[PDB]
Design an enzyme around this catalytic site. Structure first.
Site, PDB file in Angstrom:
ATOM      1  N   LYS A  48      -8.651  10.194   2.967  1.00 40.20           N
ATOM      2  CA  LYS A  48      -8.213   8.913   3.528  1.00 40.20           C
ATOM      3  C   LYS A  48      -8.052   8.950   5.048  1.00 40.20           C
ATOM      4  O   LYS A  48      -8.346   7.961   5.720  1.00 40.20           O
ATOM      5  CB  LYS A  48      -6.902   8.469   2.875  1.00 40.20           C
ATOM      6  CG  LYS A  48      -7.051   8.108   1.405  1.00 40.20           C
ATOM      7  CD  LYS A  48      -5.737   7.645   0.794  1.00 40.20           C
ATOM      8  CE  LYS A  48      -5.390   6.221   1.200  1.00 40.20           C
ATOM      9  NZ  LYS A  48      -4.185   5.722   0.479  1.00 40.20           N
ATOM     10  N   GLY A  53       0.790  -1.234   0.000  1.00 42.00           N
ATOM     11  CA  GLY A  53       0.000   0.000   0.000  1.00 42.00           C
ATOM     12  C   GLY A  53       0.818   1.278   0.000  1.00 42.00           C
ATOM     13  O   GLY A  53       2.047   1.238   0.068  1.00 42.00           O
ATOM     14  N   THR A  54       0.128   2.415  -0.067  1.00 35.00           N
ATOM     15  CA  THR A  54       0.786   3.726  -0.125  1.00 35.00           C
ATOM     16  C   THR A  54       1.394   4.094   1.226  1.00 35.00           C
ATOM     17  O   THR A  54       1.043   3.513   2.254  1.00 35.00           O
ATOM     18  CB  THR A  54      -0.180   4.856  -0.551  1.00 35.00           C
ATOM     19  OG1 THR A  54      -1.213   5.011   0.429  1.00 35.00           O
ATOM     20  CG2 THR A  54      -0.805   4.564  -1.911  1.00 35.00           C
ATOM     21  N   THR A  55       2.299   5.068   1.210  1.00 35.28           N
ATOM     22  CA  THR A  55       3.007   5.485   2.418  1.00 35.28           C
ATOM     23  C   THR A  55       2.117   6.364   3.300  1.00 35.28           C
ATOM     24  O   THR A  55       1.367   7.201   2.800  1.00 35.28           O
ATOM     25  CB  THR A  55       4.307   6.247   2.077  1.00 35.28           C
ATOM     26  OG1 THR A  55       5.050   5.524   1.085  1.00 35.28           O
ATOM     27  CG2 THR A  55       5.178   6.434   3.320  1.00 35.28           C
ATOM     28  N   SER A  98      -2.291   2.211   5.983  1.00 28.48           N
ATOM     29  CA  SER A  98      -1.769   1.748   4.699  1.00 28.48           C
ATOM     30  C   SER A  98      -2.161   0.291   4.490  1.00 28.48           C
ATOM     31  O   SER A  98      -2.170  -0.491   5.442  1.00 28.48           O
ATOM     32  CB  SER A  98      -0.244   1.868   4.668  1.00 28.48           C
ATOM     33  OG  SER A  98       0.167   3.219   4.782  1.00 28.48           O
TER      34      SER A  98
END
Ligand code: CL
Ligand code: CL
Ligand code: MG
Ligand code: MG
Ligand code: MG
Ligand code: MG
Lengths: 244, 204, 241, 213, 125, 249, 243, 195, 231
Positions: G61, G29-31, G74
């Site tokens: 988010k 997933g994203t940071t 994440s």
């Protein structure tokens, strides 16, 4: 999830057989032999204890023969623990009937209900069946003296003389040979013991390796008595028939 | 409307020298109307005797219930239930219905087969045990029975003499109660014999 | 071989999931130790904070279950906290129902019975932890009772748990052979803590700073944990003798 | 009148008609109560303890039904003990909230007039009163129980904020003395509990002293 | 409760559990039904490997569902008792609500409905 | 939710119940325990296998009181035994004492324990208990009795027997020594002799656990006044009492 | 073997492979990061702009719990939402019974126990998210990070996702260079920089920055989003540092 | 109210039951049969609360017929009466009890004896030579105490019954529109059409 | 392979295969397009038929007067989810006298789809949805996927060959966004967008399906001769 570990106890084989019922019958075939013989004036129940040890307390013991009520008794073949679960249910059912109708339960009705419970474990619930075969011996005022058998499938049938457990094939042949319809209780006692004496896997048949019971009308005037034989009483009946 | 006095009836129990007695009337009515003169209120399970007064449907129901329970007891225990044990069983069963009780006044009587000791006991409708050396009474003429028993009773009576005392207590109590009478039965209980006698009483 | 996945017997009469739960115990690589004094019960444990970004105050394997009972865990922190929360609830409920503070050994038995259920019932897995309960019981005095994933539990004169548990165990065994008694004959709890740390240093063979250790002390009517400065004070006393 | 407070009780139950009060002061808070328990006009207990501990330095005064207040106080003590094991020492407000929750949600089946009093180090002495309805009211001081009716006038005129310990003890003693004198449901000894940073102190005062005030 | 779907479809579009149940019927003793102009006759086989039987008390192969309807079967004996019981109960229930005994078609439809229900219910065969 | 509503113990093609057999194999591994019945009493005994010398073996009790007149000992898995004792004690009250106002006779309590163990053989999502029990007890109408209970739920009455590690040899030893005229003290003596064979390390009152079902103990009752209440027949022998009998061995 | 096919099954090592497999989903997933400061906490996250068609600023988010707690995660975004929904129920019942808003350590355990419960049975799947969260309570500022196993600790700085190592390295420098403490407004600026530096490990698609914060002085102890001038100021600071 | 009578004689049981069905100030029907056949040799008459009576009678009837089919055997009058009593004994402690009183007349084929049972809504069972429910008993019991003999024939029993109905028609306040009489014996159940 | 038996299982690389196989069902589904300006939002859907004798499967469903969606994948699953949305929109009106925000609508769908991917026994939904609506913050377009992921967009497309329409909208972004106060021109842009996903087949009168919602326009669906204007 849990699907991975399910044995699926209540399913059919490709041949149309119930796996678990067949395997439960295989289990029962290794259990001590039990014989029931029905005479005109009574019923005999004989059963062989499973390889007895000399330090086993024999007189205060109950393995094969159980009392359901004053008029009905059963011989067990298979897992004793399983049989006791079913026996207590049968004892309760008999008392429910008496409470409802003020009359002792007819033998077949008790047998059917106990057999219906076994059937349930083969069709639903996902549990293993009861690894037990019964020989029912009882009396009522409709059909008189009656012998039945039930097995893990929940199927039951009536008999004049029948064996369950080990060596039934050999035992049933011998019973079929010497049995006749106008037989007395005392003769049936002798047939039961002689049959066990030949089919036994032991070297010699002795009092300490047996359980025995009769259901006669030998009480005073038109009433049924259940006799669960004591050790000494088996010792005497074994000598009287010339086996020891 | 008062469950305990619709049908009517009485039970009494006494002890003697190596014996016990238990007696009851035979009336079953619907308030003023007498309906049956054959309605016995004493039952027995093995050698233990149970008398029950009060609402007749519950008398019948409890007899069938204790027959049920003592039969299973015998099968599992491989022996007949004793009076002391049975007394506890009656108490348990009644209190199980604490907030919806059977409208009854039961009375236990018997001789312990092991010790040979005469035993009697009484209960209220929710199972409070009332133990007594001398006597126990129950029913619509309980006041009368208490009066007769207290004056007539003496300890260590022989079976033949005890019969006369309990019979006179029941009869004279029943005749002062409108809802009790119409016949009577007396059980004399010795260690290994039991006699049952039907009394002649006034039929009004 | 599905008999190794759930808690049912193997052909040789073993429960592999229970055995593998024991190996999860040492996953944290921490050693603990517990000893009894005259008036107290002391428990100590290694504290390892590898990451620099961690808040070291929140890194702990010792728990205050009740006012009187303390518990140290050997195993992963999620299972440790799971056990801690349940023990706290059970101790509180016991007091409410029965009118007195739950004893250390009774709580241990209760948690051990819960652990036993996971070994018999299939849907529940065992917790991969070993729970060491300590208190000064009002009837039995200083007490140490330890529970494992098998559902086994027993009291202890002293005990140790972790990867290098056996070295610590024999170190303590040799002391009690010499002293001829069941406990540390010492008046104050301060010196019982000093004993515990000293014998861990000898057994493990490592030196400890104030942040390398974690200490819990049980006295009559209260259990408490020591701060870094309380331990530092304790380490100074050992060095000056 | 006071009847519809006592008309709430179940037939035959022990009555906790009372003279209870809690008073904040400079150093913390003091709880006070009489010791009489009645079943009608019979005094079932003349030496009762109506001041009860739910936490180290959070106590409460009980009035109304003896059974109901005891059952509630036991549950609250259980909740705060479980709170302490997880989150540390609870505030006095938190304790009052747990009392309220039980009193409000079971307002029909209960008769419990509770005063909650506690000492924090940040918040100092605090007093919350919880009447029959289950409402919460934070106050400088609070009075309750059947005997409190007779001292509304006296307490309002004589109460001051930031009193000393000795002054507050005199204020509670004189007040409960009058409540006891006039209320038949109140009597016996005057118990007190002092909550400060120093700790917990129990005080008692006997009739021979307080009657002749 | 035991929920497992025991009766399910296979790639070729068959429900094997239902088809294996038919094999159990093929194993059972023969039963025959012939209807005439003013009657119906039900014939049944009884295997002769069983001697020393008591024919008085042994369950009969033909069962009365009501005074005017009968039911015979082939296959598992224990299973048949459950269907017969359900059918007998439904026969009395019909008399109670409709004030008329069941038709043979209705009684058949009910028994057939029970059998079907066990082919797409969880936990049962 | 518990999705395991199906049996984990099933019949194999040969007719064996695998999990029961494997449970019996677990009992075989377990430490030796035995029971001997005398004319005026019953003795049950076992070795206290200590997990560590730092552990206090007094806190772990292998021999347990179930009722004042009934005691129990085991071989196999200790945790399984512990919970069975808890369940056995409770069932003695719920399904008997709270009904009849008296403690159950040995055979019936044994029957209730067997029922619990049988259910663990058939019920959904559970394994059998990995223990074999020996239950000694006394009651008025049956006198003294000794029963064995297996993982299957089967139970058998015994004059004397042994279970666990060295049960085969121990049973042979008991066959030679047992007679129907044995007094209680003689049975205790034989029990200690039998047990010495299976024990390897230290053999003393601290490593051996032994209890009896004998005469009533008024002193252990805790009160006086009621003549009918005469005290518990179950008594656990002390460490000192065992060592006295080891000198004249 | 087959030990990794079912959840809650121990391997011979003593490991739950299903939980470790969930960690792989988190690593994918994203940071996202968390920075503890003087009197509060700061949260930041990388939002990958998949297309021009994504509406800027309108795919939020970072989530709030109660009024004083911020949560970011994440991995599997839906699993994170489910966790926050539980957190809100936990925080609601705490305030209902105890009146005071839930403390951060108390809140952390509520999530921890819930996530841990999903490693106990085979009928449930472990959570596919690492969650960074915290806020301000009576005892001051707290920052936590919770993992699929149920493991959580307090943190000075926290990071997770595809660029976690880059972010961790940058966080370690801040802890060393600022022992006395970092201010709230500074932490917002630093948070931006670290996300931009951590974007080097995900540089195919360009991204959108999103920051939130709790501070006793700056936000009055409540959780707020960083918007407008203060957001653009933080972006400009980050742009200047990469060049 | 409703009149239901019963007389056991030497070789049969005779049940008489009123024909009137009244609601308010209107006799809605004057040909009502207040009985159900439970089995070929067992008959039950009933009286009590409207609706409950028929609902209860038919429920029992269904249960006894189910037993007969299952066992291919007729239950004895004693067994049927015990079953009925238990149902009423359950009923009285229900949320809404059946307010129904019944008389069960049957011929036991095994004993070759007639049997009459009287059961009230509480579940109070008694076997009697003659029985009645409601206000009828207050007249008929004393009348039968006088005129009844145990060895009477069926014809003598019908004349004894006529004597009861006449007395009720003379002294009862309500018009109950006569009775339907039924006889239970070794040959089963039959109705007397002219009474 | 060994990790795709059920939804409760993770793969060694951290993937949920049952969720990915549900995503595959969407790709097999017929194309549908969504786009919006500031004043209006538009759904355009290519309907599919079994054969020439059959009807065309309806793709667009109304949820409230101000909200509705188009589907792609398992139609029965869309019926379940659209029914849930109808109830949630309705709960908001009856209880709070409040029109349900399009963003909250997305959040509710996400959370409903998620629960089916973490429990044993159940299965993921096998359908993708495009939700459009007009609320208190203007026009909105959402994209729902059965993994749980919901995304707010200016324009998008899902189904077979949806990449063609999605590329077109990515080019046309600046143009169609400013089509304010002009419904017919916004639809035209949507019809031209879906045309980039056509192969061999063209848009006919009983094939095309259009829906619109806006400032002074309730959610209404156009089919049959009513869409002949846009061919
Ligand atoms: Cl427990
Ligand atoms: Cl009080
Ligand atoms: Mg009289
Ligand atoms: Mg009179
Ligand atoms: Mg498990
Ligand atoms: Mg006064």
């Amino acid at each position: 999830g849990s699907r991975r570990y399910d044995s699926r106890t209540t399913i059919f084989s490709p041949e149309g057989r119930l796996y678990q019922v067949e395997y439960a019958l295989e289990s029962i075939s290794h259990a001590g032999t039990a014989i029931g013989i029905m005479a005109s004036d009574g019923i005999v129940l004989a059963a062989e204890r499973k390889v007895t040890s000399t330090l086993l307390e024999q007189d205060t013991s109950t393995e094969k023969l159980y009392k359901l009520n004053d008029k009905i008794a059963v011989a067990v073949a298979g897992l004793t623990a399983d049989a006791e679960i079913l026996i207590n249910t049968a004892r309760i059912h008999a008392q429910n009937y008496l409470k409802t109708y003020n009359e002792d339960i007819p033998v077949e009705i008790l047998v059917r209900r106990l057999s219906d419970i076994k059937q349930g474990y083969t069709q639903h619930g996902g549990l293993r069946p009861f690894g037990v075969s019964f020989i029912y011996a009882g009396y009522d005022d409709r059909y008189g003296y009656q012998l039945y058998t039930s097995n893990p499938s929940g199927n039951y049938t009536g008999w004049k003389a029948i064996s369950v457990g080990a060596n039934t094939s050999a035992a049933q042949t011998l019973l079929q040979m010497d049995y006749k319809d106008d037989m007395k209780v005392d003769d049936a006692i002798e047939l039961a013991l002689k049959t066990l004496s030949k089919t036994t896997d032991s070297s010699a048949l002795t009092y300490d390796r047996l359980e025995f019971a009769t259901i006669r009308k030998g009480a005073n005037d038109g009433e049924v008595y259940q006799k669960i034989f004591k050790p000494q009483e088996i010792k005497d009946i074994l000598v009287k028939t010339g086996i020891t | 409307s008062d469950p305990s006095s619709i049908n009517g009836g009485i039970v009494v129990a006494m002890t003697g020298k190596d014996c016990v007695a238990i007696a009851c009337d035979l009336r079953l009515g619907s308030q003023s109307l007498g309906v049956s003169n054959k309605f016995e209120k004493i039952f027995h399970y093995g050698h233990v005797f149970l008398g029950i007064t009060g609402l007749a449907t519950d008398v019948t129901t409890l007899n069938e219930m204790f027959r049920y329970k003592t039969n299973l007891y015998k099968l599992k225990e491989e022996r007949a239930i004793e009076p002391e044990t049975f007394t506890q069983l009656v108490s348990s069963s009644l209190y199980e219905r604490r907030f919806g009780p059977y409208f009854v006044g039961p009375v236990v009587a018997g001789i312990n087969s092991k010790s040979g000791k005469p035993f009697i006991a009484g209960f209220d409708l929710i199972g409070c045990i009332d133990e007594a050396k001398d006597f126990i009474v129950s029913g619509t003429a309980s006041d009368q029975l208490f009066g007769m028993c207290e004056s007539l009773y003496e300890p260590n009576l022989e079976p033949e003499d005890l019969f006369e005392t309990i019979s006179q207590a029941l009869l004279n109590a029943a005749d002062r109660d409108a809802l009790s009478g119409w016949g009577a039965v007396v059980y004399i209980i010795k260690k290994d014999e039991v006699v049952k006698r039907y009394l002649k009483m006034r039929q009004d | 071989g599905y008999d190794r996945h759930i808690t049912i017997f193997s052909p040789e009469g073993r429960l592999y999931q229970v055995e593998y739960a024991f190996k999860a115990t040492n996953q944290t690589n921490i050693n603990s130790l517990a000893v009894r004094g005259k008036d107290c019960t002391v428990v100590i444990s290694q504290k390892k904070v590898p990451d620099k970004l961690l808040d070291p105050t929140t890194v702990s394997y010792i728990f205050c279950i009740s006012r009187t009972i303390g518990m140290v865990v050997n195993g992963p922190i999620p299972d440790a906290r799971n056990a801690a929360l349940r023990a706290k609830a059970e101790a509180a409920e016991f007091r409410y129902k029965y009118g007195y503070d739950m004893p250390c050994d009774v709580l241990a038995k209760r948690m051990a019975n819960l652990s036993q259920i996971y070994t018999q019932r299939a849907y529940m897995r065992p917790l991969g932890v070993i729970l060491t309960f300590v208190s000064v019981d009002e009837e039995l005095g200083p007490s140490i009772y330890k529970t494992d994933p098998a559902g086994y539990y027993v009291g202890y004169k002293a005990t140790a748990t972790g990867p290098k548990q056996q070295e610590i165990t024999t170190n303590l065994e040799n002391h009690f052979k010499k002293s001829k008694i069941d406990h540390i004959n010492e008046e104050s709890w301060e010196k019982v803590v000093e004993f515990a740390i000293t014998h861990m240093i000898d057994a493990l063979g490592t030196e400890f700073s104030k942040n390398d250790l974690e200490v819990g002390v049980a006295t009559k009517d209260k259990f408490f944990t020591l701060s870094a400065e309380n331990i530092e004070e304790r380490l100074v006393a050992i060095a000056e003798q | 009148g006071i009847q519809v407070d006592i008309n709430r009780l179940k037939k035959g139950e022990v009555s906790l008609g009372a003279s209870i009060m809690a008073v904040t002061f400079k150093d913390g808070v003091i709880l006070g109560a009489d010791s009489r328990t009645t079943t009608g006009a019979y005094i079932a207990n003349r030496v009762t303890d109506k001041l009860t501990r739910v936490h180290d330095k959070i106590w409460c005064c009980r009035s109304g039904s003896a059974a109901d207040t005891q059952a509630i106080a036991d549950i609250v003590q259980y909740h705060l003990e479980l709170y302490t094991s997880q989150y540390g020492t609870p505030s006095t407000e938190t304790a009052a909230s747990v009392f309220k929750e039980l009193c409000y949600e079971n307002k029909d089946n209960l008769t419990a007039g509770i005063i909650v009093a506690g000492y924090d180090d940040k918040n100092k002495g605090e007093v919350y009163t919880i009447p029959l309805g289950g409402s919460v009211h934070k106050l400088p001081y609070a009075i309750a129980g059947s005997g409190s009716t007779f001292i509304y006038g006296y307490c309002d005129k004589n109460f001051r904020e930031n009193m000393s310990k000795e002054e507050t003890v005199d204020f509670i003693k004189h007040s409960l003395s009058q409540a006891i004198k006039w209320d038949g449901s109140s009597g016996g000894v005057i118990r007190m509990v002092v909550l400060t940073a120093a700790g917990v102190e129990r005080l008692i005062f006997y009739p021979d002293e307080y009657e002749q005030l | 409760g035991y929920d497992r779907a025991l009766s399910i479809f296979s790639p070729d579009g068959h429900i094997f559990q239902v088809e294996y149940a038919l094999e159990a019927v093929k194993r059972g003793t023969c039963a025959v039904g012939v209807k005439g102009k003013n009657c119906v006759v039900l014939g049944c086989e009884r295997r002769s490997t069983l001697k020393l039987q008591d024919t008085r008390i042994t369950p009969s192969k033909v069962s009365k569902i009501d005074s005017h309807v009968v039911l015979s079967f082939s296959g598992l004996n224990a299973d048949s008792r459950i269907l017969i019981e359900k059918a007998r109960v439904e026969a009395q229930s019909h008399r109670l609500t409709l004030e008329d005994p069941v038709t043979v078609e209705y009684l058949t439809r009910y028994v057939a409905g029970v059998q079907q229900r066990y082919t797409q219910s969880g936990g049962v065969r | 939710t518990d999705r395991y509503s199906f049996s984990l113990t099933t019949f194999s093609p040969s007719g064996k119940l695998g999990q029961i057999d494997y449970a019996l194999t677990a009992v075989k591994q377990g430490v030796t325990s035995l029971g001997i019945k005398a004319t005026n009493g019953v003795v049950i005994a076992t070795e206290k296998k200590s997990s560590s010398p730092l552990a206090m073996s007094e806190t772990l009790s292998k021999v347990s009181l179930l009722t004042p007149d009934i005691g129990a000992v085991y071989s196999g898995m200790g945790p399984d035994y512990r919970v069975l004792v808890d369940k056995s004690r409770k069932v003695a009250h719920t399904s008997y004492k709270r009904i009849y106002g008296e403690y159950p006779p040995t055979k019936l309590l044994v029957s209730e324990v067997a029922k619990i163990m049988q259910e663990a053989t058939q019920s959904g999502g559970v394994r059998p208990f990995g223990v074999s029990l020996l239950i000694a007890g006394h009651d008025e109408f049956n006198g003294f009795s000794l029963y064995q209970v297996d993982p299957s739920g089967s139970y058998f009455p015994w004059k004397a027997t042994a279970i666990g590690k060295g049960s085969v040899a121990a049973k042979t030893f008991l066959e030679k020594r047992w007679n129907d005229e044995l007094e209680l003290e003689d049975a205790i003596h034989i029990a200690l002799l039998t047990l010495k064979e299976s024990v390897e390390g230290e053999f003393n009152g601290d490593t051996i656990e032994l209890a009896i079902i004998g005469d009533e103990n008024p002193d252990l009752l805790g009160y006086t006044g009621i003549p009918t209440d005469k005290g518990p027949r179950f008594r656990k022998l002390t460490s000192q009492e065992i060592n006295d009998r080891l000198e004249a061995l | 073997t087959g030990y990794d096919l079912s959840n809650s099954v121990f391997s011979p090592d003593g490991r739950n492979f299903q939980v470790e497999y969930a960690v792989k989903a988190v690593e994918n997933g994203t940071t996202s990061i968390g920075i503890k400061c003087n009197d509060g906490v700061v949260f930041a996250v990388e939002k990958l702009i998949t297309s021009k068609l994504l509406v800027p600023q309108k795919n939020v988010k970072i989530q709030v719990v109660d009024r004083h707690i911020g949560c970011v995660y994440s991995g599997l975004i839906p699993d994170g939402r489910h966790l926050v929904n539980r957190g809100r129920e936990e925080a609601a019942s705490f305030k209902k019974l105890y009146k005071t808003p839930i403390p951060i350590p108390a809140f952390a355990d509520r999530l921890g126990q819930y996530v841990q419960a999903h490693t106990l049975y085979n009928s449930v799947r472990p959570f596919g998210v690492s969650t960074i969260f915290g806020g301000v309570d009576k005892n001051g500022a707290h920052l936590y990070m919770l993992e699929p196993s149920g493991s959580y600790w307090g943190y000075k700085g926290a990071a997770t996702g595809k660029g976690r190592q880059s972010a961790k390295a940058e966080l370690e420098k801040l802890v060393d260079h600022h022992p006395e403490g970092l201010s709230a407004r500074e932490a917002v600026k630093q948070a931006a920089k670290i996300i931009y530096l951590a974007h080097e490990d995900n540089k195919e698609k360009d991204f959108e920055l999103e920051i939130s914060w709790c501070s006793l002085s700056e936000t009055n102890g409540l959780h707020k989003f960083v918007k407008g001038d203060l957001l653009q100021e933080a972006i400009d600071f980050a742009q200047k540092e990469i060049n | 109210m409703d009149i239901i009578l019963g007389i056991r004689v030497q070789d049969s049981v005779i049940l008489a039951s009123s024909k009137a069905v009244t609601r308010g100030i209107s006799v809605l029907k004057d040909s009502d049969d207040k009985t159900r056949q439970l089995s070929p040799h067992t008959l039950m008459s009933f009286a009590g609360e409207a609706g409950d009576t028929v609902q209860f009678a038919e429920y029992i009837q269904a249960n006894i017929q189910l037993y007969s089919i299952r066992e291919d055997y007729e239950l004895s009058p004693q067994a049927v009466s015990s079953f009925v009593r238990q149902e009423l004994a359950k009923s009285i402690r229900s949320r809404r009890p059946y307010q129904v009183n019944v008389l069960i007349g049957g011929y036991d084929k095994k004993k070759n004896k007639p049997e009459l049972y009287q059961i009230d809504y509480l579940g109070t069972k008694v076997e009697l030579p003659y029985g009645a429910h409601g206000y009828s008993g207050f007249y008929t019991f004393s009348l039968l105490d006088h005129h009844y003999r145990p060895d009477m024939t069926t014809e003598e029993g019908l004349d004894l019954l006529k004597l009861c109905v006449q007395e009720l028609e003379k002294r009862m306040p309500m018009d109950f529109k006569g009775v339907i009489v039924k006889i239970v014996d070794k040959d089963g159940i039959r109705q007397v059409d002219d009474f | 392979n060994n990790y795709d038996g059920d939804t409760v299982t993770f793969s060694p690389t951290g993937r949920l295969f049952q969720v990915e196989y549900a995503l595959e069902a969407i790709k097999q589904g017929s194309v549908t397009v969504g786009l919006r300006s500031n004043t209006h939002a538009v759904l355009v859907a290519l309907k599919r038929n079994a054969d020439e004798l059959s009807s065309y499967q309806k793709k667009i469903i109304k949820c409230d007067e101000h909200m509705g969606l188009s589907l792609a994948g398992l139609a029965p699953d869309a019926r379940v989810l659209s029914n849930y949305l109808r109830q949630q929109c309705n709960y908001s009106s009856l209880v709070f006298n409040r029109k349900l925000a399009v963003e909250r609508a997305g959040h509710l769908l996400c959370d409903k789809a998620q629960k089916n991917t973490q429990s044993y026994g159940g299965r993921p939904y096998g359908v993708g949805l495009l939700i459009i609506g007009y609320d208190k913050s203007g026009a909105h377009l959402l994209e729902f996927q059965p993994s749980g992921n919901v995304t707010e967009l200016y324009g998008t497309a899902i189904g077979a060959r949806s990449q063609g329409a999605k590329t077109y909208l990515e080019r046309t972004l600046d143009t169609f966004i400013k089509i304010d106060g002009n419904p017919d021109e916004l639809i035209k842009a949507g019809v031209e967008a879906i045309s980039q996903s056509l192969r061999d087949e063209s848009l006919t009168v009983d094939n095309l399906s259009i829906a619109i919602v806006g400032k002074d326009t309730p959610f209404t669906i156009y089919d049959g001769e009513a869409v002949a204007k846009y061919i």
